[PDB]
Every structure is written in structure tokens, then in C-alpha cells.
Amino acid sequence: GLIYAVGGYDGNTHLNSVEAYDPERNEWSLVAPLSTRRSGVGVAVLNGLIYAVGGYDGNTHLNSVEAYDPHHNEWSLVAPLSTRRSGVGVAVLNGLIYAVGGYDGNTHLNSVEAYDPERNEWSLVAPLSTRRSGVGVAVLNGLIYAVGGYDGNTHLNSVEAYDPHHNEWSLVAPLSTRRSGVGVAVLNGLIYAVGGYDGNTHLNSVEAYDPERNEWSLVAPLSTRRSGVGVAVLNGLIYAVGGYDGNTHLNSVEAYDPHHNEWSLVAPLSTRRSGVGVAVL
């Protein structure tokens, strides 16, 4: 019932702090911080815990992973990834956490690994068609979609879907615009791609993917350009959290109502946060 904003980058320092948003009171409040600073961190919720996957602490890219238990307000480190990953996309499917692409410092990654919490183990599965960091990742109709990103030498409009029963990725319809640092979430059977960076401007635009028609369509843009934005879905709204408009890092937060195709600004974070991980628990 809360939106957690995990780590990020305030323009100055990389952040270990974590804050939670209560929509009934329109307030953020700080809770226990991560064991390490993490920007470009992937976040997902599994079995009542928030996992913070990889990221960048300012002076090394991270393979470490930690889980937050809200009943005890504590983070605990678990098994690390096979490779350091910042700008990594994270989603939960059939009881596993998938870590998709990212950047290890030395190269941008097409590799993908899955975490089983019952064995505390990551294992590598089929890689993406292309290397992708700053990639948005969401689960819809039993597939993991990898949306946009950056392959090292071009920003990407392409999109690919992973079928776990065949261990295969396949390319589908591309976005209208190239998008890295893009936030992605699923609402009423559509995938929304929120903001990002096309290589030469930060984006306020938003588009929605309909899997039945394999088509993206542009909807109402954000109030502000936002790359490195965290996106989550709560009570029928899409929240866009923080990000970077090109010339300042953002503490602002806005919510999208699909029935009215309108974004509205709500209470801002305690800290500016880009490269922030967002999940709902």
C-alpha cells in the first residue's frame, strides 16, 4: 500500500536513503537506509520483501543485492549477482527476480539472470538480443518486456519480450522514440513507457503498449522531462518519481490517471533522486 523510493542520485552524492509514500496522507517518510549507496538500482517486490539489485555507489558498480523487510524496517544482504549491474531492469515472474541487462563498468550487458529466493541463488538465462542499460522492464501476460535502453553506442527504441517457458527473447514493436533511463509499468493490460532520454533530449513524453495489437501509442506527457525516473502503479494510478530533466535532478512526483489521461503533481520526495528504484509494498 506504500510506494518505496530506493536510493538514487541527488546531483551531488549517491544515496543510501529510502522513503515511503502513503497516498492516503500524501506524505513521504524516510525509513531504514540501504547498506550501500545505490543509483541505477533495480527494485522489485517478492514474498513481502523489497529487493534492491545492483547499482552504483559512486565509485564502483555493484553486484550486491539486499532485501528490505517492512515488519522490521531492516535491509539484509543476500546472494550477489553473477556480474556487477547498474542501470539494470528488474521484474518478478513466477516467483523469480529477473535482472535484465545493465552496465558492469567495463561493458554494457545483454545478459540476464534470475534469483530463486528459496535457494538464495542467481542463475544466468537467455540473453537479450542487444545490450541494454537504462532499460525499463515490466511483466505482462506471463512475459518480461525489456523496453529501450542504451547499448553503449546508441540509444534504443527497440523492445523485446522474454518467454520463460521457452527461455527465449523476441523483438516486438519498437517505441515511437528512443528511450534510455525510461520508467516502465503495467496498468489495465498496457505497458507504459514514461520519460527517458533519446540521446539528444530528455523526454516528457509517455507511450502505452497494447499487446493485443502490438502497437505503442503516445498519451499525455509528464509535467516535466524525466530520465532516470522511477515508476510504479498504486490504486489505479501510475506514479512517476524523481528523475532528471536535463538541468536539475528532481524531487517532484506526479501521478497519471488513465481514465482522464492526465498527470498531476503530488507531494515531493525529501531528497532529489534520479536513478531511483521504485516499488509498491
What does this structure look like?
The chain has no helices and 24 strands. By secondary structure, the chain is an all-beta fold. The protein has one domain (3-280): Kelch-type beta propeller (Neuraminidase, 6 Propeller). The strands form six sheets. It has a four-stranded antiparallel β-sheet, with no helix packed on it. A four-stranded antiparallel β-sheet has the order 4-5-6-7, with no helix packed on it. A four-stranded antiparallel β-sheet has the order 8-9-10-11, with no helix packed on it.
Brief summary:
With 281 residues, this protein is mainly beta. Helix content is 0%, strand content 53%.
For this structure, what is the CATH homologous superfamily?
A: Kelch-type beta propeller
Q: Write the CATH architecture name.
A: 6 Propeller
- Mind telling me the CATH class? Mainly Beta
Outline, from the CA principal axes?
A: globular
SSE topology string: EEEEEEEEEEEEEEEEEEEEEEEE
The largest pleated sheet is described as:
4 strands, antiparallel
Strand content: over 45%
Radius of gyration: 17 Å
Q: Which strands sit side by side, in order, in the main sheet? A: 3-2-1-24
CATH fold category name = Neuraminidase
- Our measurement of the CA-to-CA distance between the termini, rounded to an integer number of angstroms, reads 5 Å
Whole-number total of structural domains:
1
SSE-based structural type: mainly beta
Secondary structure: number of strands:
24
Q: Can you give the helix content as a percent range? A: under 10%
